[PDB]
Design a protein around this ligand. Structure first.
Ligand SMILES: C#CCCCn1c(Br)nc2c(N)ncnc21
Ligand SMILES: C#CCCCn1c(Br)nc2c(N)ncnc21
Ligand SMILES: C#CCCCn1c(Br)nc2c(N)ncnc21
Ligand SMILES: C#CCCCn1c(Br)nc2c(N)ncnc21
Lengths: 261, 261, 261, 261
């Protein structure tokens, strides 16, 4: 079928890409980076993230694969020494697919802008103090003062979510997790402190109190949005699909990355 | 139908219990504490927990209700001023039920003992050092040294789980969460640190390294088990069912208990 | 003697300032905001911080006093209802002085810039990743990857230091405390995680690895420094002196602000 | 002078001890374990702790030395390959001494019992709930509910203190640090959460609310004390003295143990 390969652009990744294309030429496989059904990422998790966002249009028509030419990654989880075996079973088709949930971020102005995130989306202030009211399913939950907030996908919990004390979540759980960044807690102000895990269809809304300008990140991308009226988080109806050629459990992936490998 | 009422045993709880029984006498309602289908708890969450464990036999035949005569609780979430309205709609039946997941704990010796937990189950050492190997779905994940571990139900995440830095989890998520107690982390030993959230059918197994005696707690109950070979945690196939007479969202319950009420 | 009064600029603070000046006119007291020996701050801790930095020149010639017209502050710790009693004992002189330590921050380029901080000084990246090597007393201690670092004075430990998990430190301890912001810890990278408390004469040096542009804050002030070669932290030889008219222990001040008042 | 050597009792430690005694026989050195002025510990930090408590009587008459036959320790910080060079410079005398602060723990009943701790002292409940009022310098600071509390010496901050989120403190700072274990924080109850660092002469007193039986630990030793009226912590007037034969900075010791070695 159709396929494309993105590369980190260093020496080993470009050469591994050319070898897989050459190997792909020995099968009923066509290179098309416009409407591929198999996107192969070569490099790191950042290379995978760029591949994911490049094709966020046709998510339900693509199965992704990540190859790590550096250290092990949670998305680029196949060693380069596995490329030739990868080439063959991709071309013979008839492989299993696994799907991970995604996080929808809606930004509303005084207009609307929506975004899809594979790792997480964060909100910080444009320089001054960051104060927002946190509204869960239309109920006002808390007034947050601090550096910012982070809403994470399940598979995103091993990234920035982990650095803020959030929990690690198996990606088969359709959920999103919200964590705090350096929150102020005293006798006047109060935050929950604990990370919060939300199921499907629960809507978390951030609403400004004074400053209406926020630095909003979605995975690697980060833009200052002006005159923001609301930020809305919820588990996405869309999922990312992976090609599954071997058993590599999420908890083993977590172990190899943090305990020992 | 059949029903029973348990009470904390102070003055207000006993008197509120006698008033509800008297109010119940005005309907087609029979007091039976052997095979009730409605268990009403009056007191605190601890009173509710005792009620839950008293009838862990016929869980799929009981709808629980908690009334708090003290501060608000996550299970005893109906004010005493609501007892008379509670009496009427319980007797007229035709109410909605909601179900929360439970945590199964299997203890194996050199024999087997299983337990059901509504909040959490914890493991500590019998005095000396606590060292266990943590095995997730037969894969060895880590060797834990510290004070102990805690596996929490979703609704249990607001209790002991919360005090250890775990995340708060909406009880509609069929999951369990494992947290660490004062873990040793150095150049020799390594723990994940982060709390871990497990879905249904994932089995977490604790296995001793040297000391085979552990203090194991299940909700309020705590017993020293001797010559333990394995502790096994997994989300239970059984659920606890609540009678639902009004909208009281879990996040509002969390807000009222920790932010302000 | 000479004195000046700074005000937050709202209605109550300006009026309380004019009342104290009028009360001061009944004594041997001269208003001079160029070479005062008593600086009175009216407003919040932020008002006090501006007063401190306005006169960082003649620190060993000034005794500061803070009055809070809002909530209680750690520097503005005298209620407005105490202004008239404040006026009298300030003019009669013969009061006790107490001194708190300060933090010296040296910035070196490819030139040198030094700063004094009453609360803390923080370092973040100019947008990209923040990576620095941490050098303690010329010994390379760690390579830090994360959002940033924070070095706090003793009295500064109740501010930003507290929000990052640092310890609260009695201001009679001549020390500085370094805390981490959302550090990445895996199998490749390693940080201490724990906050570190440094005594007098211990020099902590931050050195860039790739990006040489950092956003450096000193109390309220925050500037992007370009082509930074080194950031150097150490306990200052200068101290800030307070006028002491009553017993108000630091731990009571901490209690009133965080537990209950 | 007089000296003694304690050993962990395995094969290498006993043999290294006999070699040092034999090496000591070639100098003006006498083995006396009753009134030694040089106590040499061979094994781990636990071996050192037993040596410290064995001679807590004549602390101001002893210089301690620790040799690690296992991994590096914060007190047993000299490799076994250094024993013969150790023997010579110990016998030639004329070495430098360094001193670390200690923590005094006073227990009062309805009688008095005092203890000296090199690492830390902890308080937990005898089984039921642990509730104590925390009194700082006679001022009531907080009512603590949780698993327990831990007061740590400076050098003790790398042990249990570190596992609870406390800060690492250079041992030249005459201080003590108090940390919380799994504290309950809600709308009814309030703890500071943050670790607290206390200077010399600040007295921290724990006072029971209901249960008057506590499990109190002092370094390795742990005893259930009955009918406790008060627990009192303060920096000790006594210090432990080390023999200093080389530069081994505390921060390098911290680095080697937690970052890499
Ligand atoms: C090291 C480093 C920087 C972050 C790498 N990274 C990315 Br990108 N996505 C990640 C993920 N989902 N889980 C863990 N790590 C991730
Ligand atoms: C205050 C106090 C002691 C714990 C009360 N408690 C119990 Br019992 N179950 C609880 C729960 N599920 N969520 C929150 N709190 C809970
Ligand atoms: C509320 C709020 C914002 C921070 C106020 N604040 C300032 Br400014 N200095 C502070 C200090 N030293 N200790 C505690 N709080 C402080
Ligand atoms: C590994 C392990 C168990 C604790 C060892 N240990 C002891 Br004993 N005292 C210690 C200390 N002061 N700093 C760090 N570690 C210490």
């Amino acid at each position: 079928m159709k396929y494309m390969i993105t590369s980190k652009g260093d020496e080993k990744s470009d050469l591994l890409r050319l070898n897989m294309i050459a190997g792909f030429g020995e099968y009923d496989m066509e290179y098309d980076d416009v409407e591929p059904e198999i996107v192969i990422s070569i490099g790191g998790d950042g290379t995978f993230l760029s591949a994911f966002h490049q094709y966020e249009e046709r998510l339900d028509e693509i199965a992704f694969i990540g190859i790590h030419t550096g250290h092990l990654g949670f998305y680029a989880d196949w060693r380069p020494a596995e490329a030739d075996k990868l080439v063959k079973l991709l071309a013979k088709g008839e492989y299993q697919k696994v799907s991970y949930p995604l996080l929808k971020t809606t930004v509303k102005y005084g207009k609307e802008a929506t975004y899809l995130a594979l790792n997480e989306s964060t909100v910080k202030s444009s320089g001054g103090p960051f104060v927002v009211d946190v509204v869960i399913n239309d109920i006002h939950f808390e007034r947050f003062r601090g550096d910012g907030l982070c809403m994470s996908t399940p598979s995103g919990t091993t990234a920035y979510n982990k650095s803020l004390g959030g929990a690690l979540m198996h990606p088969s759980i359709e959920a999103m997790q919200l964590t705090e960044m350096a929150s102020i807690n005293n006798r006047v102000y109060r935050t929950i402190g604990s990370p919060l895990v939300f199921p499907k269809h629960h809507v978390v809304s951030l609403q400004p109190v004074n400053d209406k300008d926020f630095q909003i990140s979605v995975d690697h991308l980060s833009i200052l949005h002006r005159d923001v009226q609301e930020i809305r988080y919820e588990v996405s109806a869309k999922k990312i699909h992976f090609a599954r050629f071997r058993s590599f459990p999420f908890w083993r992936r977590v172990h190899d990355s943090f305990i020992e490998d």
